[PDB]
Design a binder for this molecule. Structure first.
Ligand SMILES: *[C@@H]1O[C@H](CO)[C@@H](O[C@@H]2O[C@H](CO)[C@@H](O[C@@H]3O[C@H](CO)[C@@H](O)[C@H](O[C@H]4O[C@H](CO)[C@@H](O)[C@H](O)[C@@H]4O)[C@@H]3O)[C@H](O)[C@H]2NC(C)=O)[C@H](O)[C@H]1NC(C)=O
Ligand SMILES: *[C@@H]1O[C@H](CO)[C@@H](O[C@@H]2O[C@H](CO)[C@@H](O[C@@H]3O[C@H](CO)[C@@H](O)[C@H](O[C@H]4O[C@H](CO)[C@@H](O)[C@H](O)[C@@H]4O)[C@@H]3O)[C@H](O)[C@H]2NC(C)=O)[C@H](O)[C@H]1NC(C)=O
Ligand SMILES: [Cl-]
Lengths: 303, 301
């Protein structure tokens, strides 16, 4: 086994039923060496006596909070977790994958080094989430990640509505304009009732840029039939715009980048003659095939 | 004196002839302490006996490779170098200065942090060159420089063709759009057979930008009198051009920025009426008074 934190350990178990479990020592962190007994949460009563308790673990019933006992008082506790491994493959049962089979969707609204990663859960009961840089060595990328959180947005797939947890992360060393030489390698420690699973992902910020919708969309009726649609760069997006230039796509509708026909405009305004419908605009990084922003739309209504 | 490398030292000497030299101890790095003798390259034969040889140094004859000798075998060697100082001024005699009176001409074809520094030599016989950041401390700029090398191109001044040594350098921390707050402070240690001289230079990359000539100059014959001359940014030049915008100067001739007449154009093409002669174009950084690129020319036909 291997330690995760104070009084918390993780047992690598081969789940194939023909293979035997792993025997593990649990020693009580106390000066005493007589009158030492153990009580598990999974099993009522005492299971073993002596300072060092050696137990075989193959099922979740052999996990949990093992707590010592002497003279009727608790001495020290130790919590165990299981990491399933079937045919030499680590379990991925806590999280729900996306259509693309990945578990960690990460997106960045600018080159500021800040980004956010989201994931889907199979169930929402007694979950603990931690995320940290998976390399943590010279020639790596220092990233500080805040706490995870449930997003109001539920994500629906083939029929089932899965819940989504997101987390905000910030890179420490940041020169926005610098070309990315080495990818950000992240890892997610996911824990449920006693099951331990971790996920990995390596990405460049440049490859996960998704700008925000253009701001202050204006629809100024100019000519009897024509209207000037205007907008501005999103306040979120990186400055200076002279370097971080977004190109925009204009569309007309009758009430990832999805391109079903649109006229390209790199300026922040365009005249259009629609006479009914809705004018919509999405933004994209000009010099890179980054994901496009969500459409911002105005109704076509002329004087 | 002060050490430069293993068994190589440098003596600061006041060259004025009325001032006395500097006495320096040279001890042989050997356990033995008897039968120790010294042989210099400057002087044939033995000069001193004993483990510690104390010698006065004022001329180059008092420099060179002092080598020990015991029982017919060499023990250890020590090489000395001189840094002349006349009227409290350090010598600058190895290098030849440029037209601008500076010794280290440094230029950058883009903002990539890469640049190259060149210098001229008075003579080319037994030269050793080293170049490094002259500050190399917090509040400095980390730069890694490769080896120097002689350029086939000779540079002629007044009648004399001086040879040119160049070196390629790369800054480690490079943040393109960030404004340069502190200059790159470089230094060049130059040695000729026994003379030690060092040179310094402090510059911003923004101040040494010299683009390359515009590429693919074309002459499209227009209708009735005009011809459209076109060109493109140099592949060397920094991307994205929307930020790094070059302005061009076009001129026509019938045969540092040197201007005997040229009209400014910021686009990559212009109509002109020359009918014989040559159309030429040079590039310059739009937002800064950087040095202009060399002229690219096509014959007007
Ligand atoms: C993702 O999951 C995998 C699989 O669960 C996980 O790999 C395992 O990580 C542990 C912890 O790093 C490894 O255990 C180590 O094993 C060696 C040799 O047996 C021991 O020497 C280590 O202990 C010493 O060093 C530690 C660190 O200095 C100390 O904490 C400790 O007190 C000892 O001094 C340690 O027990 C285990 O071998 C791997 N197994 C495999 C097959 O990969 C991976 O780390 C997880 N990653 C994340 C980001 O969650
Ligand atoms: C350009 O050339 C000039 C002139 O040669 C040069 O100035 C001199 O630099 C030397 C560098 O060694 C200075 O010498 C030091 O002097 C102090 C006090 O006397 C000593 O303590 C120093 O010795 C330490 O370092 C030695 C080598 O590691 C150790 O062996 C020793 O034990 C000490 O730790 C050292 O000798 C000298 O003082 C200056 N001159 C002046 C006027 O101050 C200049 O540095 C050169 N610049 C460049 C960019 O090349
Ligand atoms: Cl991703």
């Amino acid at each position: 086994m291997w330690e995760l934190e104070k009084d918390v350990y993780v047992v690598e178990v081969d789940w194939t039923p023909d293979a035997p479990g792993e025997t593990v020592n649990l020693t009580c962190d106390t000066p005493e060496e007589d009158d030492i007994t153990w009580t598990s949460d999974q099993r009522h009563g005492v299971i073993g006596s002596g300072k060092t308790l050696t137990i075989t673990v193959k099922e979740f019933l052999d996990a949990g909070q093992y707590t010592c006992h002497k003279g009727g008082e608790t001495l020290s506790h130790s919590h165990l977790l299981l990491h399933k491994k079937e045919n030499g493959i680590w379990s991925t049962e806590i999280l729900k994958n996306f259509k693309n089979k990945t578990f960690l969707k990460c997106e960045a609204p600018n080159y500021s080094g800040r980004f956010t990663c989201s994931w889907l859960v199979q169930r929402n009961m007694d979950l603990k989430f931690n995320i940290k840089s998976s390399s943590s060595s010279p020639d790596s990328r220092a990233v500080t990640c805040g706490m995870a959180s449930l997003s109001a947005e539920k994500v629906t797939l083939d029929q089932r509505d899965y819940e989504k947890y997101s987390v905000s992360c910030q890179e420490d060393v940041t020169c926005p304009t610098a070309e990315e030489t080495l990818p950000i390698e992240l890892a997610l420690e996911a824990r449920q009732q006693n099951k331990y699973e971790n996920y990995s992902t390596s990405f460049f910020i440049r490859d996960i840029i998704k700008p925000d919708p253009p701001k202050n969309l204006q629809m100024k009726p100019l000519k009897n039939s024509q209207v000037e649609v205007s907008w501005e760069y999103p306040d979120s997006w990186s400055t200076p715009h002279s370097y971080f230039s977004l190109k925009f796509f204009v569309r007309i509708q009758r009430k990832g980048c999805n391109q079903k026909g649109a006229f390209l405009v790199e300026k922040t305004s365009t005249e259009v003659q629609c006479k009914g419908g809705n004018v919509c605009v999405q933004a994209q990084d000009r010099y890179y095939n980054s994901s496009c922003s969500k459409w911002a739309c105005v109704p076509c209504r002329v004087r």
